[PDB]
Design an enzyme around this catalytic site. Structure first.
Site, PDB file in Angstrom:
ATOM      1  N   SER A 145      54.064  42.515  38.243  1.00 50.80           N
ATOM      2  CA  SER A 145      53.749  42.180  36.868  1.00 50.80           C
ATOM      3  C   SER A 145      54.888  41.383  36.232  1.00 50.80           C
ATOM      4  O   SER A 145      56.037  41.462  36.663  1.00 50.80           O
ATOM      5  CB  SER A 145      53.524  43.460  36.071  1.00 50.80           C
ATOM      6  N   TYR A 158      56.810  51.324  32.750  1.00 51.27           N
ATOM      7  CA  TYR A 158      55.858  50.635  33.622  1.00 51.27           C
ATOM      8  C   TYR A 158      56.520  49.412  34.265  1.00 51.27           C
ATOM      9  O   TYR A 158      56.191  49.039  35.384  1.00 51.27           O
ATOM     10  CB  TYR A 158      54.630  50.197  32.820  1.00 51.27           C
ATOM     11  N   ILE A 191      45.410  39.198  32.979  1.00 46.57           N
ATOM     12  CA  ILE A 191      44.161  38.908  33.674  1.00 46.57           C
ATOM     13  C   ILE A 191      43.107  39.809  33.060  1.00 46.57           C
ATOM     14  O   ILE A 191      43.372  40.970  32.792  1.00 46.57           O
ATOM     15  CB  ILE A 191      44.318  39.199  35.182  1.00 46.57           C
ATOM     16  N   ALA A 192      41.916  39.272  32.827  1.00 40.55           N
ATOM     17  CA  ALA A 192      40.852  40.051  32.208  1.00 40.55           C
ATOM     18  C   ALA A 192      40.299  41.183  33.070  1.00 40.55           C
ATOM     19  O   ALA A 192      39.413  40.956  33.894  1.00 40.55           O
ATOM     20  CB  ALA A 192      39.735  39.123  31.786  1.00 40.55           C
ATOM     21  N   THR A 193      40.821  42.397  32.871  1.00 41.41           N
ATOM     22  CA  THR A 193      40.381  43.585  33.622  1.00 41.41           C
ATOM     23  C   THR A 193      40.007  44.751  32.715  1.00 41.41           C
ATOM     24  O   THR A 193      40.216  44.721  31.499  1.00 41.41           O
ATOM     25  CB  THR A 193      41.480  44.167  34.541  1.00 41.41           C
ATOM     26  N   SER A 194      39.485  45.801  33.339  1.00 44.31           N
ATOM     27  CA  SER A 194      39.101  47.001  32.621  1.00 44.31           C
ATOM     28  C   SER A 194      40.332  47.617  31.952  1.00 44.31           C
ATOM     29  O   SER A 194      40.229  48.265  30.908  1.00 44.31           O
ATOM     30  CB  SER A 194      38.499  48.007  33.599  1.00 44.31           C
ATOM     31  N   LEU A 195      41.495  47.427  32.565  1.00 47.77           N
ATOM     32  CA  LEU A 195      42.733  47.969  32.020  1.00 47.77           C
ATOM     33  C   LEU A 195      43.058  47.238  30.724  1.00 47.77           C
ATOM     34  O   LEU A 195      43.394  47.865  29.714  1.00 47.77           O
ATOM     35  CB  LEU A 195      43.866  47.800  33.032  1.00 47.77           C
TER      36      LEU A 195
HETATM   37  N1  LIG Z   1      44.954  43.136  34.249  1.00 42.71           N
HETATM   38  C1  LIG Z   1      46.140  42.657  33.902  1.00 42.71           C
HETATM   39  O1  LIG Z   1      46.195  41.928  32.918  1.00 42.71           O
HETATM   40  C2  LIG Z   1      47.388  43.035  34.747  1.00 42.71           C
HETATM   41  C3  LIG Z   1      47.402  43.987  35.807  1.00 42.71           C
HETATM   42  N2  LIG Z   1      48.657  44.236  36.524  1.00 42.71           N
HETATM   43  C4  LIG Z   1      48.748  45.078  37.726  1.00 42.71           C
HETATM   44  O2  LIG Z   1      47.594  44.804  38.565  1.00 42.71           O
HETATM   45  C5  LIG Z   1      47.172  46.025  39.250  1.00 42.71           C
HETATM   46  C6  LIG Z   1      45.686  46.259  38.931  1.00 42.71           C
HETATM   47  O3  LIG Z   1      45.490  46.432  37.531  1.00 42.71           O
HETATM   48  P1  LIG Z   1      44.124  46.139  36.746  1.00 42.71           P
HETATM   49  O4  LIG Z   1      43.129  45.434  37.583  1.00 42.71           O
HETATM   50  O5  LIG Z   1      44.428  45.560  35.435  1.00 42.71           O
HETATM   51  O6  LIG Z   1      43.571  47.604  36.486  1.00 42.71           O
HETATM   52  P2  LIG Z   1      42.161  48.349  36.506  1.00 42.71           P
HETATM   53  O7  LIG Z   1      42.311  49.613  35.763  1.00 42.71           O
HETATM   54  O8  LIG Z   1      41.112  47.399  36.085  1.00 42.71           O
HETATM   55  O9  LIG Z   1      42.035  48.647  38.059  1.00 42.71           O
HETATM   56  C7  LIG Z   1      43.010  49.447  38.741  1.00 42.71           C
HETATM   57  C8  LIG Z   1      42.367  49.954  40.020  1.00 42.71           C
HETATM   58  O10 LIG Z   1      43.309  50.851  40.641  1.00 42.71           O
HETATM   59  C9  LIG Z   1      42.662  52.079  40.931  1.00 42.71           C
HETATM   60  N3  LIG Z   1      43.524  53.279  40.884  1.00 42.71           N
HETATM   61  C10 LIG Z   1      44.412  53.651  39.909  1.00 42.71           C
HETATM   62  N4  LIG Z   1      45.007  54.807  40.217  1.00 42.71           N
HETATM   63  C11 LIG Z   1      44.466  55.133  41.395  1.00 42.71           C
HETATM   64  C12 LIG Z   1      44.749  56.294  42.185  1.00 42.71           C
HETATM   65  N5  LIG Z   1      45.634  57.225  41.799  1.00 42.71           N
HETATM   66  N6  LIG Z   1      44.047  56.396  43.383  1.00 42.71           N
HETATM   67  C13 LIG Z   1      43.135  55.459  43.801  1.00 42.71           C
HETATM   68  N7  LIG Z   1      42.886  54.377  43.033  1.00 42.71           N
HETATM   69  C14 LIG Z   1      43.532  54.189  41.838  1.00 42.71           C
HETATM   70  C15 LIG Z   1      41.599  52.219  39.873  1.00 42.71           C
HETATM   71  O11 LIG Z   1      40.519  53.135  40.206  1.00 42.71           O
HETATM   72  P3  LIG Z   1      40.252  54.527  39.437  1.00 42.71           P
HETATM   73  O12 LIG Z   1      40.531  54.369  38.013  1.00 42.71           O
HETATM   74  O13 LIG Z   1      38.674  54.753  39.594  1.00 42.71           O
HETATM   75  O14 LIG Z   1      40.952  55.575  40.179  1.00 42.71           O
HETATM   76  C16 LIG Z   1      41.102  50.778  39.825  1.00 42.71           C
HETATM   77  O15 LIG Z   1      40.088  50.532  40.849  1.00 42.71           O
HETATM   78  C17 LIG Z   1      48.133  47.101  38.746  1.00 42.71           C
HETATM   79  O16 LIG Z   1      49.223  47.372  39.649  1.00 42.71           O
HETATM   80  C18 LIG Z   1      48.649  46.558  37.410  1.00 42.71           C
HETATM   81  O17 LIG Z   1      49.890  47.170  37.068  1.00 42.71           O
HETATM   82  C19 LIG Z   1      49.907  43.665  36.106  1.00 42.71           C
HETATM   83  C20 LIG Z   1      49.893  42.719  35.049  1.00 42.71           C
HETATM   84  C21 LIG Z   1      48.635  42.377  34.450  1.00 42.71           C
HETATM   85  C1  LIG Z   2      48.694  44.667  27.962  1.00 47.28           C
HETATM   86  N1  LIG Z   2      49.526  44.513  29.183  1.00 47.28           N
HETATM   87  C2  LIG Z   2      49.849  43.088  29.415  1.00 47.28           C
HETATM   88  C3  LIG Z   2      48.615  42.477  30.146  1.00 47.28           C
HETATM   89  C4  LIG Z   2      47.914  43.679  30.803  1.00 47.28           C
HETATM   90  C5  LIG Z   2      48.769  44.900  30.384  1.00 47.28           C
HETATM   91  C6  LIG Z   2      49.790  45.175  31.507  1.00 47.28           C
HETATM   92  C7  LIG Z   2      50.926  44.061  31.562  1.00 47.28           C
HETATM   93  O1  LIG Z   2      51.675  43.978  32.539  1.00 47.28           O
HETATM   94  C8  LIG Z   2      51.086  43.054  30.348  1.00 47.28           C
END
Ligand SMILES: NC(=O)C1=CN([C@@H]2O[C@H](COP(=O)(O)OP(=O)(O)OC[C@H]3O[C@@H](n4cnc5c(N)ncnc54)[C@H](OP(=O)(O)O)[C@@H]3O)[C@@H](O)[C@H]2O)C=CC1
Ligand SMILES: CN1[C@@H]2CC[C@H]1CC(=O)C2
Ligand SMILES: NC(=O)C1=CN([C@@H]2O[C@H](COP(=O)(O)OP(=O)(O)OC[C@H]3O[C@@H](n4cnc5c(N)ncnc54)[C@H](OP(=O)(O)O)[C@@H]3O)[C@@H](O)[C@H]2O)C=CC1
Ligand SMILES: CN1[C@@H]2CC[C@H]1CC(=O)C2
Lengths: 259, 259
Positions: A145, A158, A191-195
């Site tokens: 990240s 984080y 990136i556009a995700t559920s998070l």
């Molecule tokens: N989206 C963004 O803007 C950014 C994302 N990131 C990094 O990218 C990665 C993915 O994030 P993102 O796509 O946003 O998140 P999401 O929440 O959309 O997806 C994360 C995925 O990880 C899985 N997961 C989390 N914990 C566990 C666990 N303990 N066991 C098994 N599976 C797990 C979730 O499944 P479940 O919940 O069903 O267990 C889910 O499928 C992360 O490392 C995040 O830190 C970094 C910067 C930006």
């Molecule tokens: C909000 N915050 C922004 C974009 C997704 C989430 C995690 C990260 O690394 C920075």
């Protein structure tokens, strides 16, 4: 496997039930790889498998809580048998976020985020090592990240876990080079995700998010697949000289300062 | 405190019985600050206390094992009581190194180093926060390492703890800026400490160390007083505009590639 594809290569992607992990399963699945992913929900994975296998993807998955040491061990055994002890790609994507200030973190928050975001990635890497070597052409990709190199609100711990992971990435590139394993990190921007979705539910985090997109050169969020494309390239036999690198897919947000 | 001195300032420096830490106590106190230090060896502290007091430094010391959440609190209380609830400087210097490859690390191992190297510094900073604020001119200085940014043999995990620290340093400078606290990190290169004396007892590692020294511009080992010097300045009021920095006192190590 060809210069620009993964036909035949096996792979494990953590947390591929949503967002980027999902974008990554699809990207590799579409390029010829046989994938194996995981999440903490069976029904969710099954709905994923239904969609993936409908496009001819060679995919398989199974429920696993990466926050648990004993489970990760079980995961590696299963995947190993599944791939006949040969794994070419390991994408350490699973990660969670806990938006709180540094001083507001409970031993519970800290221990959870650290086990899942770093421990788990470190741990799985090591478990997968003997299989990556036996593959004779292993690749480990960590999903970092921008928050592991630069300060962002509520992401100190984080970022601390992502900053640890990046040093890990760097060192492993040198310790596993002789094992035919290239190791690289990919730091996504926004990136556009559920998070990100659950995030903007908060009027403050949403305001904080639009600040980020504004500090972008592209000034927009990325798509799970724009990120996944970088992860895929790093796995092709074409990226042979690329190792120990941390690359950001942030639409230019790392290069910014006064824009 | 004038622009270039520390007279009247109070500080806590973890691990001041030997090495860089011992060096930092002498420098800050020499500059007029009131120090408090710790270590796990009481007899050593006592020899030190006698050394420092003999020359007039104002300093106190207690035993504390930073690898313990409770003992750390215990320490913050005394310190706070000792300094009447106002702390100007916190220097997170304590650290240990376990020279195994990432895949050869046992749990006790990972836990030990992660606990001392990153946990205690994080924990101690939070606990100190309130008196840092009350002092009205707080300074937090994390002692990192060159290994926190680049691959060094047997220091994959150690480096991960410094990479986490480094990211936390950046974030804290922002979260605590309105509290009138400055947060920076000082990454040493190869300083002649007891840790090093111990490290070079092994032939292979002796070879590894020489590799580094030959790799820095000044082709030599720095001295604890030379690392202390950079820590005393970031604490000086003269350094009021410096926050969120990770400075390397390495003799050119970090700028090298082909030399
Ligand atoms: N989206 C963004 O803007 C950014 C994302 N990131 C990094 O990218 C990665 C993915 O994030 P993102 O796509 O946003 O998140 P999401 O929440 O959309 O997806 C994360 C995925 O990880 C899985 N997961 C989390 N914990 C566990 C666990 N303990 N066991 C098994 N599976 C797990 C979730 O499944 P479940 O919940 O069903 O267990 C889910 O499928 C992360 O490392 C995040 O830190 C970094 C910067 C930006
Ligand atoms: C909000 N915050 C922004 C974009 C997704 C989430 C995690 C990260 O690394 C920075
Ligand atoms: N020397 C070098 O070349 C470099 C050092 N560093 C960093 O500098 C810092 C100090 O290293 P250095 O001076 O070389 O090491 P030394 O071993 O010379 O000194 C470390 C000091 O920290 C104390 N310490 C360690 N663990 C604890 C603990 N759990 N509780 C209380 N005190 C503790 C030790 O005392 P005791 O063992 O008696 O408890 C000792 O006084 C560390 O953060 C290290 O990672 C980074 C790069 C280079
Ligand atoms: C050998 N190795 C060098 C210098 C001391 C020891 C620990 C570290 O951080 C880098």
């Amino acid at each position: 496997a060809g210069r620009w594809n993964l036909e035949g290569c096996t792979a494990l992607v953590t947390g591929g039930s949503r967002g980027i992990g999902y974008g990554i399963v699809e990207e590799l699945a579409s390029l010829g790889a046989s994938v194996y992913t995981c999440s903490r929900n069976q029904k969710e994975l099954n709905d994923c498998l239904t969609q993936w296998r409908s496009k001819g993807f060679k995919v398989e998955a199974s429920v696993c809580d990466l926050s648990s040491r004993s489970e990760r061990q079980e995961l590696m055994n299963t995947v190993a048998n599944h791939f006949h002890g040969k794994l070419n790609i390991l994408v350490n994507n699973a990660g969670i976020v806990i938006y709180k200030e540094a001083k507001d973190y409970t031993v519970e928050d800290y221990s959870l985020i650290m086990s899942i975001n770093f421990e788990a990635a470190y741990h799985l890497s090591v478990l997968a090592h003997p299989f990556l070597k036996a593959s004779e052409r292993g690749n480990v990709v960590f999903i970092s990240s921008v928050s592991g190199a630069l300060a962002v609100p509520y992401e100190a711990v984080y970022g601390a876990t992502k900053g640890a992971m990046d040093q890990l990435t760097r060192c492993l590139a040198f310790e596993w080079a002789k094992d035919n394993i290239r190791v690289n990190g990919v730091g996504p921007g926004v990136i556009a995700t559920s998070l990100v979705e659950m995030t903007i539910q908060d009027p403050e985090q949403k305001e904080n998010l639009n600040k980020l997109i504004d500090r972008c050169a592209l000034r927009r969020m990325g798509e799970p697949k724009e990120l996944a494309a970088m992860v895929a390239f790093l796995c092709f036999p074409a990226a042979s000289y690329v190792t120990g690198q941390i690359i950001y897919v942030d639409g230019g947000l790392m290069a910014n300062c006064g824009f």
